[PDB]
Design a protein around this ligand. Structure first.
Ligand SMILES: *[C@@H]1O[C@H](CO)[C@@H](O)[C@H](O)[C@H]1NC(C)=O
Ligand SMILES: *[C@@H]1O[C@H](CO)[C@@H](O)[C@H](O)[C@H]1NC(C)=O
Ligand SMILES: *[C@@H]1O[C@H](CO)[C@@H](O)[C@H](O)[C@H]1NC(C)=O
Lengths: 228, 230, 224
């Protein structure tokens, strides 16, 4: 009986714009009369459940049980407890869901680095990296937009957060968006959206352009002489 | 009896980090045992209703009650009804406020405008404006932060939304942050934050500084008289 | 009751080069004995109000009043009282129309702002705004002129005056001009004029174009 109730990630919270709690049974024979429900503080019980599949190649009952509940309820510590009433165990399988309060809350520092000059000289592609550093919960979401329109998820790839060597509490992550080199030369502005809990507005946007790392000063001095 | 309530705009709920709506009753006699609550169409009212204001000396109430309500439930289209029971009106008075449905949801087109040279040449101050235009509906919230830190609301003021001349459906707004010239000389982010429901992430951030724009300056210092005609 | 006595703002007197007094009749019987006051302190009667409004659908009667009063006489501070002799009230309602005096006059500091780089990069429309700062009181009739010919009122929108955050006495105003990007690229010597009483000539002009907004870039030096 593997009731792995993994809380949805913050990227999943701002991806589908809905908080779906997870209480899924793994490695168990599919049976009937399973009355799953969520019990919280003050005895509230609101639930809608779908995605029930009788047959599985691994002989594991799905019992996905995804319900839409407001984010403020999670922010209030409602301790969402799953109550899977399986036949073998008459007592409901209690699995609580709550945010691990007590962790450090450091806002990320978003830096939109310009593409390398040699790669643009190669005239093949233009990969703009979005270096996100300094976040303790390590729950970061990176999304790219062009002219205010979000791009397809397959154009940009985001690496999983990993601990920072200098700061043990803080974490860092990176993501790259690959476009054509003349697309970069066109003058389009790319915005990197970084979603995190510690941010005052929960998101942060940085804009990159052709004129973000150009040489502000040219100091050419043409000196010509006819003597040794 | 002028019955009216102020619906919680997106700007207010974005500023307060919570969704709360007020029930307001005007031109009624001063009786005790006030029972006002926002009843959802399923028949379940608000949990708590506190912070009721005190009557004006002119025998007119502007009392407002606040409660914690889910934002998804409000903006999904579910209308909220306020029940008003009092000795003056034995029949239960009802109120209704709800955001309009079917209105065009177009993202704002934010273009921050750097200040002109002459305001910098004058030594009094510098004004940085964040031109927000082409957004529907009219409601919008503009916030200014410096280096990721929120600034005081007294420094920046947001203009009231007005329709765009080209398109009647869209609207445009202004927000000016007045800062000293020496602050503009130093490198500061001075981020402009625009909040709107039609945006995907609901927040648009733009940055500006002294090095913003700044076409490349050339310093050609050529020496040619050393040849002296071979 | 209530009467919509709207004093003529500085914009109205600036546009028509004359003062057009307005005292809108509201909340009165449509076809009852009505006597609106249109006399000065001395009692002289102005010319009869023109363009009388028709019968409003509700019980309230509507009427548009106009008058031709001078500039300094209207600035002299005499009282233009609006009172109506009507049978629905035993006593007539008085709402005097007069300029409020004692307000400080501050010279506006207008500074036109070039269009943003992102707007010039996306290239859908070009919005040129004329920022008005440090003007008091809250009155403005800022305009927009194209190559010497003023643009249509519909093209430009003038924002309502609001108190300045740093200076409570002073106010600010906005006036955007939505134009084509190619028009800005070609250069149409757009100009902005702002109307205010505190200026020595009541209006000042600022000129902008594409070459404006571009500093000196080419510091080529010839030395011997
Ligand atoms: C540019 O070059 C000149 C000499 O050619 C030098 O004196 C000057 O310091 C240089 N500019 C900067 C910013 O260093
Ligand atoms: C431009 O060149 C002149 C002549 O060499 C020099 O004196 C000046 O400092 C330069 N300006 C810069 C480098 O900003
Ligand atoms: C331009 O060049 C002259 C050459 O003498 C120099 O004095 C001046 O400082 C330069 N200005 C800039 C902004 O580089």
């Amino acid at each position: 009986i593997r009731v792995f109730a993994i809380p949805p990630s913050f990227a999943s919270i701002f991806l589908t714009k809905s908080t779906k709690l997870t209480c899924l049974v793994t490695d168990l024979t599919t049976y009937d009369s399973v009355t799953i429900s969520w019990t919280r503080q003050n005895g509230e019980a609101v639930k809608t459940h779908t995605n029930i599949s009788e047959s599985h190649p691994n002989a594991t009952f799905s019992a996905v049980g995804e319900a839409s509940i407001c984010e403020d309820d999670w922010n209030s510590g409602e301790r969402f407890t799953c109550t899977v009433t399986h036949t073998d165990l008459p007592s409901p399988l209690k699995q609580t869901i709550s945010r691990p309060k007590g962790v450090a809350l450091h806002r990320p520092d978003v830096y939109l680095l310009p593409p390398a000059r040699e790669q643009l000289n190669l005239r093949e592609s233009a990969t703009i990296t979005c270096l996100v550093t300094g976040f303790s919960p390590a729950d970061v979401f990176v999304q790219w937009m062009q002219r205010g329109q979000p791009l397809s998820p397959e154009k940009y790839v985001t690496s999983a957060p990993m601990p920072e060597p200098q700061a043990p509490g803080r974490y860092f992550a990176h993501s790259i968006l690959t476009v054509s080199e003349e697309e970069w030369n066109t003058g389009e502005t790319y915005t990197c959206v970084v979603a995190h809990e510690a941010l005052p507005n929960r998101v942060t946007e940085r804009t990159v352009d052709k004129s973000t790392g150009k040489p502000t000063l040219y100091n050419v001095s043409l000196v010509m002489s006819d003597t040794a």
